[PDB]
Every structure is written in structure tokens, then in C-alpha cells.
């Protein structure tokens, strides 16, 4: 992993964030990380992988470019001193971010939402027969 992969990362990133907002919709993330080249790439199917990555999400369900990079990077390297060193290094080189949930909590939120939705639909069906 070297400049080639990171250079590739932001070239790919620009296609997904043309206005250079530094954020991408969570709904586009699976496509984004699938599109990268190896090793940073996480090939499809990757939805549960991305959940397990526990990425911070900000209002409007967006995820910052660096959180993704670091996660993809740590995925290949591991929790090492170099990884820690590289991250801090990269953040400085890269340099409002406020997390309201994470991809991991969000999957549980989806499950809870579905319980509610199904109960409401059942309620509507029961009402219409009585």
C-alpha cells in the first residue's frame, strides 16, 4: 500500500463527491468501496462488512472521506503502530464533522424500524376488517 492506492482513492472519491464536500451518502458507500482497486477495495457483497466497520455517520446519513479511508486502510494493515502513525500523518496531510450514529448502530435501528413498520401495517390491516 503506497501513494498509488491513496491517489487512486481520491480519484475515485471525486467521482462520488464532485462538489468536494468531503462526504458521501451511506447508500452509495457499497458501490464506492467496491469501485476502488485492491487492496483498499472491499468487493461486493460488502453491506454487512460496512456495518461491522462501524463508520461514523453525520446528519443526512453521510460519511466523511477520511473515516472511510482510515477504515479501509486499517482493514488491510491492522491495529499497528504504523497504522496509527499513518492515520495521524494522513489526517494532517488531508487537513464540521458531527456523528449522530454509526453504520453498526444503524443496522439495529433498521431492524427496530421494521418491527414498528410491520406492527403498524398489521394494525392498518386489522382496522380495515372491523
Amino acid at each position: 500500500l503506497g501513494e498509488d492506492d491513496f491517489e487512486m482513492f481520491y480519484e475515485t472519491w471525486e467521482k462520488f463527491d464532485p462538489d468536494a464536500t468531503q462526504f458521501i451518502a451511506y447508500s452509495r458507500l457499497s458501490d464506492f468501496v467496491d469501485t476502488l482497486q485492491e487492496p483498499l477495495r472491499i468487493a461486493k457483497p460488502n453491506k454487512i462488512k460496512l456495518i461491522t466497520l462501524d463508520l461514523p455517520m453525520v446528519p443526512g446519513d453521510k460519511i466523511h472521506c477520511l473515516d472511510i479511508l482510515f477504515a479501509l486502510t486499517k482493514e488491510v494493515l491492522g491495529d499497528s503502530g504504523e497504522m496509527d502513525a499513518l492515520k495521524q500523518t494522513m489526517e494532517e496531510k488531508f487537513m464540521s464533522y458531527e456523528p449522530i450514529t454509526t453504520t453498526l448502530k444503524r443496522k439495529h435501528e433498521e431492524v427496530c424500524a421494521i418491527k414498528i413498520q410491520r406492527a403498524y401495517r398489521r394494525h392498518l390491516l386489522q382496522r380495515s376488517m372491523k
Binding site: 446519513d61 435501528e109 433498521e110 424500524a113 421494521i114 414498528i116 413498520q117
Partner: peptide, 18 residues
């Protein structure tokens, strides 16, 4: 928001009645 943003999203008609 939750009802229409996640899961088996409620329709406009459904969420309004909810």
C-alpha cells in the same frame, strides 16, 4: 423521519396516518 428513512419504509399515506 425514521419511518420513511429506514427499513420497510412507510409510504406517504401510511406515515401520515401513523
Amino acid at each position: 423521519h425514521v419511518m420513511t428513512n429506514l427499513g420497510e419504509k412507510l409510504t406517504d399515506e401510511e406515515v401520515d396516518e401513523m
